[PDB]
């Protein structure tokens, strides 16, 4: 057989379309001011980022060591506005938009763009409408427990920073796309992943699902976790299948 489509997604025509993107959305390099105090920035712009649901905020900070201003690109939280002051650091207040160590915020606070490691500059809860919940602190050997959008519980060090509030851009997925063309335009600014041909619509040379005098898979579509590339298609390492009626 030939190299299946999933195996060809290794670069080339499958790279991300990034010309129209203004910059990665990052927290700010963890520095002396944030470790010990706070630093104030002003929201200069709130902008659309092609390929991203959530809007981005360009935030201007004074450089502590040089006569210069540093512009940061943040994931905008809902409620943020241009001209707003945001404060980042250990002593920042618990206000929507501020950036604080998760260990400095009480249990139950709603946060976004949370670091997995202290200083990684934001990993968790970044897509539109998403957030992370503080679940508890363990002061001895400081580790904070958080709930992720997937429902998983994670332990981050109580120095990983987070942004107070929910990512802006609301309930985007509530609107039916309604048309192939709208899906076309959504993925045109993302990557070459649409439209998708079904495996069973192919010939055996193309896909493990291909071939047959009717369109059918043949063997089970739940394939083992340790399948080789080229046979790892369908429902990979599925714990179960079918329409769930009540889950947790």
């Amino acid at each position: 057989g030939r190299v299946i489509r999933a195996q060809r997604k290794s670069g080339g025509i499958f790279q991300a379309h990034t010309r129209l993107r203004k910059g990665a959305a990052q927290l700010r390099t963890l520095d002396f001011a944030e470790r010990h105090g706070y630093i104030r920035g002003v929201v200069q712009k709130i902008i659309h980022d092609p390929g991203r649901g959530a809007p981005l905020a360009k935030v201007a900070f004074r450089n502590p060591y040089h006569y210069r201003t540093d512009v940061e690109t943040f994931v905008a939280t809902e409620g943020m506005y241009t001209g707003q002051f945001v404060y980042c650091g250990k002593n920042a207040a618990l206000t929507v938009g501020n950036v604080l160590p998760v260990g400095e915020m009480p249990e139950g606070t709603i946060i976004s763009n949370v670091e997995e490691k202290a200083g990684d500059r934001g990993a968790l809860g970044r897509s539109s409408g998403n957030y992370v919940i503080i679940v508890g602190h363990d002061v001895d050997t400081g580790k904070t427990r958080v709930k992720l959008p997937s429902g998983a519980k994670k332990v981050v060090p109580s120095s990983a920073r987070g942004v107070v509030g929910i990512v802006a851009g609301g309930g985007r997925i509530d609107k039916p796309l309604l048309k192939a063309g709208r899906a076309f335009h959504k993925y045109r600014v993302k990557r070459n992943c649409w439209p998708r041909t079904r495996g069973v619509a192919m010939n055996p040379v193309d896909h493990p699902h291909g071939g047959g005098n009717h369109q059918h898979v043949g063997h089970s579509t739940t394939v083992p976790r340790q399948s080789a590339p080229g046979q790892k298609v369908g429902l990979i390492a599925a714990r179960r299948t079918g329409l769930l009626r009540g889950a947790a």
Binding site: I46, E78, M80, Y81, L94, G129, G170, R172, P176
Partner: protein
């Protein structure tokens, strides 16, 4: 005159896509094209510019607001703010 009993703004789609789909789009489209009130200026000159971005007109408060995809504020964001404010006001005192 009424010009439409049901489809409203979704009349542009005609008979395509299915009634339920057009009805769901109709509820969202009415939201995303509505005018909302600016809390900082008091005028109803708040309209959307691209999905989470709500702008204001006039010579005053040319600011831009980060909001929901289809409405200026979401219920989740509003509930989070009061939750955050309660938590802020209980460690403060």
């Amino acid at each position: 005159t009424k010009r439409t009993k049901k489809v409203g703004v979704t009349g542009k789609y005609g008979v395509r896509y299915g009634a339920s789909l057009r009805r769901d789009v109709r509820k969202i489209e009415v939201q995303q094209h509505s005018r909302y009130q600016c809390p900082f200026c008091g005028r109803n000159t708040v309209k959307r510019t691209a999905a989470g971005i709500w702008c204001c007109n006039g010579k005053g408060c040319k600011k831009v607001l980060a909001g929901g995809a289809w409405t200026v504020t979401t219920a989740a964001a509003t509930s989070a703010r009061s939750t955050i404010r309660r938590l802020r006001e209980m460690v403060e005192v």
